């Protein structure tokens, strides 16, 4: 009554987008360490029960197409959906290999009116990326 | 009828406007913390309990080490945005 129904055949799809190398036009450098992140993330979400697929060094058109086609699949036997983005970022935007695309446009494909087989089901997005260039100096 | 924006959860590695830190030899801070809590509690804790413990590990266990003194001894706190309507267990 207070938990999401998890009595489905599959836990769900989990898409990992692992962007490490970027075009010289973007100005962004290599994200060393993100391969250890994606491999550790792949094992932990696989262990949860997700069907994990990892895509590497994606464009902004590929990232939009991946999430739009995942939005268009049949999720009737899935309990939830998960997406993990590992890339460079600025505020409200995630970096492809060839530039930036808005995070809102990536996630809007899974709205209630645009993906009916995930209606009333949790859609989770984990975003490892910068959101600006401010630093947290901390306090003792 | 139900809102088209319902049942979304965004687990951001940092707060709006701020940097996200990544160790090249052992991975990003947020992912390091997320996969230690998940390996230990992914199947017995609710998603907000998991992510709250990740907020604590990122905030307490990580501090920047840079040669550049403008980037030295910096901290990070992650950011959870929840439009969920129920509790979520992976169990």
């Amino acid at each position: 009554t207070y938990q999401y129904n998890m009595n489905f055949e599959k836990l769900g799809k989990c898409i990992i987008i692992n962007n490490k190398n970027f075009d010289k036009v973007t100005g962004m450098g290599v994200r060393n360490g993100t391969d250890k992140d994606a491999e550790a993330l792949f094992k932990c979400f696989r262990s949860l029960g997700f069907d994990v697929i990892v895509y590497n060094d994606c464009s902004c058109a590929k990232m939009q197409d991946l999430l739009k086609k995942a939005s268009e699949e049949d999720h009737t036997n899935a309990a939830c959906f998960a997406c993990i983005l590992l890339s460079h970022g600025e505020e409200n935007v995630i970096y492809g290999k060839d530039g930036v695309t808005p995070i809102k446009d990536l996630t809007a494909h899974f709205r209630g009116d645009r993906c009916k087989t995930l209606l009333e089901k949790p859609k989770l997005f984990f975003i490892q990326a910068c959101r600006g260039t401010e630093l947290d100096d901390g306090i003792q | 009828k139900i809102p088209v924006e319902a049942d979304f959860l965004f687990a951001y590695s940092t707060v709006p406007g701020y940097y996200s830190w990544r160790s090249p030899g052992r991975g990003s801070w947020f992912v390091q913390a997320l996969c230690s809590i998940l390996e230990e509690h992914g199947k017995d804790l609710e998603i907000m309990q998991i992510l709250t413990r990740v907020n604590d590990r990122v905030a307490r266990h990580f501090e920047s080490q840079s040669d550049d003194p403008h980037f030295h001894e910096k901290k990070q706190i992650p950011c959870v945005v929840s439009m969920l309507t129920k509790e979520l267990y992976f169990s």
Binding site: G29, R31, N32, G33, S87, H88, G89, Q128, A129, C130, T133 | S13, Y19, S20, W21, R22, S23, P24, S28, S64, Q65, S66, F71
Partner: peptide, 4 residues
């Protein structure tokens, strides 16, 4: 330690 690098930033994203």
């Amino acid at each position: 330690d690098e930033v994203x």
